Design a binder for this molecule. Structure first.
Ligand SMILES: [K+]
Ligand SMILES: [K+]
Ligand SMILES: [Mg+2]
Ligand SMILES: [Mg+2]
Ligand SMILES: [Mg+2]
Ligand SMILES: [Mg+2]
Ligand SMILES: [Mg+2]
Ligand SMILES: [Mg+2]
Ligand SMILES: [Zn+2]
Lengths: 119, 202, 220, 98, 82, 68, 129
RNA sequence: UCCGCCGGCACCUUAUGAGAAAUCAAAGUUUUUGGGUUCCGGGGGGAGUAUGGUCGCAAGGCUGAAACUUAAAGGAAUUGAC
């Protein structure tokens, strides 16, 4: 088998977290970046980390991943959620209520509400 | 004619179907249910729901440090409202899965000691409610008709299932807390839009 | 040194809280043994009750672990019980001492007859159960002594009880349950609502609420 | 030690239940205790439906089904794998599987 | 509690549950002490509140919610809160 | 209703209506008399104005009965 | 069958008090139960109780205040002279400072403390504390 | 079809309860010990044996020991090994 161990996977995620800008989609370029930004004792370990990191870069391109936290990417998602339509989805007028609901409001003395109307 | 603060909120809650309960009613939630229709669905008395919101707000304002208040939800529909509720009220929001041992394991990073706990649904948030009973932590929860009341100090009778219902409830609660602090003007209106609390699907 | 990780630890470390009764009043859990060493530290006195080896069957042999029972108390209304299992006798004892401090409870004391001198016996009849062991304590007149077996007697001495009558039912030879049952009835001395407690409660702010500003500021 | 609340059978408010004979070995077993399975399948196996249909002497004809009710004793049901030994927690599940 | 002379002989006076009147022991970690703020004519917190203590027994039974509602419905009518 | 949300001395009139006649705070029969000549609501005798049954006697559609 | 109406009345109150109820209904009612309640009421162990007339035996609704630890009958009703009151208290009461044993004497139903003052013996009905 | 009441065979969740635990909505309301009443147990064997009585056609039933012997037998649950 060729399952990467925690050493390879854990190191690869850390590199991408704080060097996402430097990392590219090319294995040969990535393995040269690891030498510059990390101390990997063995060449074989460095190749495995570079290859798995390149695999993770491809994962990030298509969508978000689980164990990698990219601060710049997170900010983009926040802005989209904050966007809301100018028209509220709750219509105060033309409120459809049932017979029981109307009687419930009568007990409260609020049977004169504008929006409330029987179905 | 002009509508009082209570009437305006009840009108807003009706549009969000906050009064529509589950087909089953817990024996400790009967005191809040008004009537059962032939469909079998219980109707929550919105008059009592508003009163419990005021009582919950009084407890929240009594907390000197808002950071001691933790509000969280497990279901995705409430994950947006809790974040916005903490943004305006200064509370601490925890959206997603609760890590066991947060309130009991003092040596893990996520350890916390809140003074108050706010939850969206006791049935889905059983873990934090169960764990809160080991640290003298009072809890406030929005409870539906079929919601267990165990270890719940203040239960707000409302529909904690629909996306609109969850957002409106937190929007009203956030407004009440700020109004009781004097930060914003009284009345049923707030410069913040309720749609910021509704769930935003991908 | 000590770096508190809980709100009480900082307050005790700072010095805002200076008595265990202020903690017992609000029923706040205690998780750090340094808190106990800071409030009633010098007056405490630990004592190992028994070393109990336990064995787990394994393919190669039987895993022998040592279980230590430790009782702590100042002899003036505070007593604690702690049990820890460890692979080493010394490690078990040290951990048992820590656990005993974390479980310290207030022990209420009363008078058999006339209220003359300091309290010397339990205020009422109290019983505690653990497993099959049930230990009963009945108020006794001054000078009667502690009429109890060795295990309850040691706990009562550390709790400050001077005279009491005791009876037991069940397997008292199970020391773990015998000592725990004795500790169980001691904590119930404050749970019985006597007429003198009928006075309406006067609530006071909890330490967390009283010192919110100090707790809000991070400690560095 | 009592293994099941029902005692391995289904009898409440009655003294005696007449037994049935196991379809496999003929062992006597109370009807409420026997494992019952109602098997409904085509009288012709799927491997022969095509051949039989091609040789049918009628323009339209529906192949009849074979209805067989099987009543097993405990030993035969376990051996035949009609039922399996379940964990202590899973024994209480009474709903049929998927 | 009090010696024949008058001196107190108790370490502390445990709280009593506001609903069941039960004493709250030092290890009753399920018990919670709650504060309800007081408002003014405008409706702004004035720094005053009413305290309620609940034992673990009642909270475990699920009756804390009903107990708190009844207690508040009475207390507010006495201090003018509404 | 929870025990503490109800008053035993002054139960709601609707609640006592559906309770068993013997289990109410004060026992009260569910039967009554009516005109048509008084007829018992649970009459055990054939009057054919009413036909006895296991409960209330089956009245006849034709005649009109007035409760009293 | 119903043997001791007093036992049912006290057992119902004890169960209700532990459950944290505010009210409890006692049925049937008797003048022995009412006098037993009055002794408890005078010592501040129960609140206000109301007798309901149903033309058969009546009923009692008792308001609880949370001060009652336990209340039970002693059956059979043993004879207790004044000299033997001390032994019974050492058996049934938590301590020598609170708790009352209710006795039925020729002078009426009263607690053991009152019996000593009047120096009258009788039979044990129950106890509470 | 919907709501409710009384009675019955049961089931499901739960502990504020109980228990050595399995588990029990009773096996709960028990050292904070007492509603009424019947039967019945006192380490394991010898032994439901001997003997006497009694019932039965018989098979046996009911009643029912001692000498002597023994430091365990047994209940529930845990980890292994099988
Ligand atoms: K079966
Ligand atoms: K039924
Ligand atoms: Mg077996
Ligand atoms: Mg039957
Ligand atoms: Mg049979
Ligand atoms: Mg169960
Ligand atoms: Mg007994
Ligand atoms: Mg024997
Ligand atoms: Zn078979």
């Amino acid at each position: 088998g060729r399952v990467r161990t925690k050493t390879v996977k854990k190191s690869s995620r850390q590199v991408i977290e704080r060097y996402y800008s430097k990392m590219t989609l090319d294995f040969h370029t990535n393995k040269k970046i690891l030498e510059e930004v990390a101390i990997i004792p063995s060449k074989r370990l460095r190749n495995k980390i570079a290859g798995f990191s390149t695999h993770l870069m491809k994962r990030i391109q298509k969508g978000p991943v689980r164990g990698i936290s990219l601060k710049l990417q997170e900010e983009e998602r926040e802005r989209r959620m904050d966007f809301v339509p100018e028209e509220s989805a709750i219509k105060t007028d033309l409120i459809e209520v049932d017979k029981e609901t109307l009687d419930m409001l009568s007990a409260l003395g609020m049977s004169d509400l504008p929006g409330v109307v029987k179905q | 004619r002009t509508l009082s603060t209570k009437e305006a909120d009840i009108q807003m809650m009706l549009a969000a179907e906050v009064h529509l309960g589950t087909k089953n009613c817990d024996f400790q939630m009967e005191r809040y249910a008004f009537k059962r229709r032939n469909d079998g669905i219980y109707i929550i008395n919105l008059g009592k729901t508003w009163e419990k919101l005021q009582m919950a707000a009084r407890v929240i304002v009594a907390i000197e440090n808002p950071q001691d208040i933790i509000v969280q939800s497990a279901r995705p529909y409430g994950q947006r409202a809790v974040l916005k509720f903490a943004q305006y009220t200064g509370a601490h929001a925890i959206a997603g899965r609760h890590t066991p041992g947060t309130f009991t394991n003092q040596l893990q990073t996520s350890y916390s000691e809140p003074r108050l706990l706010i939850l969206t649904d006791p049935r889905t948030d059983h873990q934090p409610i169960k764990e809160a009973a080991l640290g003298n932590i009072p809890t406030i929860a929005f409870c539906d008709t079929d919601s267990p009341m165990r270890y719940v100090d203040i239960g707000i009778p409302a529909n904690n299932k629909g996306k609109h219902s969850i957002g409106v409830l937190f929007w009203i609660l956030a407004r009440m807390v700020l109004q009781m602090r004097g930060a914003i003007n009284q009345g049923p209106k707030w410069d913040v839009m309720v749609d910021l609390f509704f769930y935003r699907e991908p | 040194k000590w770096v508190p990780v809980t709100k009480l630890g900082r307050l005790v470390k700072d010095g805002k809280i200076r008595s265990l009764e202020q903690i017992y009043l609000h029923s706040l859990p205690i998780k750090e043994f340094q808190i106990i060493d800071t409030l009633i530290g010098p007056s405490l006195k630990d004592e190992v009750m028994k070393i109990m080896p336990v064995q787990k069957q394994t393919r190669a042999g039987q895993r022998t672990r040592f279980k230590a029972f430790v009782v702590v108390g100042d002899g003036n209304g505070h007593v604690g019980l702690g049990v820890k299992c460890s692979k080493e006798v010394a490690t078990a004892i040290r951990g048992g001492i820590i656990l005993a401090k974390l479980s310290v409870i207030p022990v209420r004391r009363g008078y058999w007859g006339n209220k003359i001198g300091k309290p010397h016996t339990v205020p009422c009849k109290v019983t505690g159960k653990c497993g099959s062991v049930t230990v009963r304590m009945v108020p006794a007149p001054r000078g009667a002594g502690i009429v109890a077996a060795r295990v309850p007697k040691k706990v009562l001495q550390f709790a400050g009880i001077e005279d009491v009558f005791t009876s037991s039912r069940g397997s008292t030879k199970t020391l773990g349950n015998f000592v725990k049952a004795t500790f169980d009835c001691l904590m119930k001395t404050y749970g019985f609502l006597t007429p003198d407690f009928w006075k309406e409660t006067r609530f006071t702010k909890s330490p967390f609420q009283e010192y919110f500003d100090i707790l809000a500021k991070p400690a560095n | 030690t009592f293994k099941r609340r029902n005692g391995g059978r289904n009898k409440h408010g009655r003294g005696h239940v007449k037994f049935i004979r196991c379809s496999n070995c003929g062992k006597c077993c109370p009807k409420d205790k026997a494992i019952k399975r109602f098997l409904v399948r085509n009288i012709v196996e799927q491997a022969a439906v095509r051949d039989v249909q091609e040789a049918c002497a009628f323009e339209l004809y529906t192949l009849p089904k074979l209805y067989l009710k099987m009543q097993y004793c405990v030993s035969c049901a376990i051996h035949s794998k009609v039922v399996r030994v379940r964990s202590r927690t899973d024994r209480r599940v009474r709903e049929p599987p998927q | 509690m009090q010696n024949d002379e008058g001196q107190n002989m108790d370490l502390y006076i445990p709280r009593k549950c506001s609903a069941t009147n039960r004493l709250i022991t030092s290890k009753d970690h399920a018990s919670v002490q709650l504060n309800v703020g007081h408002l003014d004519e405008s409706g702004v917190y004035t720094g005053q509140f009413t305290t309620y203590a609940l034992c673990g027994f009642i909270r475990a039974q699920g009756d804390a919610d009903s107990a708190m509602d009844r207690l508040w419905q009475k207390k507010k009518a006495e201090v003018g809160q509404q | 209703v929870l025990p503490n949300d109800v008053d035993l001395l002054n139960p709601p009139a609707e609640h006592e209506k559906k309770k068993h006649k013997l289990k109410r705070l004060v026992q009260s029969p569910n039967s009554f008399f009516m005109d048509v000549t008084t007829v018992f609501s649970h009459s055990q005798t054939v009057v054919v104005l009413c036909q006895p049954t296991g409960g209330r006697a089956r009245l006849i559609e034709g005649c009109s009965f007035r409760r009293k | 069958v119903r043997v001791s109406v007093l036992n049912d009345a006290l057992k119902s109150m004890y169960n209700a008090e532990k459950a944290g109820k505010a009210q409890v209904e006692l049925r049937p009612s008797s003048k022995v139960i009412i006098k037993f309640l009055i002794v408890m009421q005078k010592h501040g162990y129960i609140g206000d109780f109301q007798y309901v007339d149903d033309h058969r035996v009546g009923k009692i609704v008792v308001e609880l205040n949370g001060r009652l630890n336990k209340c039970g009958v002693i059956s059979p009703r043993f004879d207790v002279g004044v000299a033997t009151i001390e032994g019974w208290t050492a058996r049934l009461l938590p301590s020598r400072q609170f708790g009352y044993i209710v006795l039925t004497t020729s002078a009426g139903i009263m607690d053991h403390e009152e019996a000593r003052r009047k120096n009258v013996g009788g039979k044990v009905l129950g106890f509470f504390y």
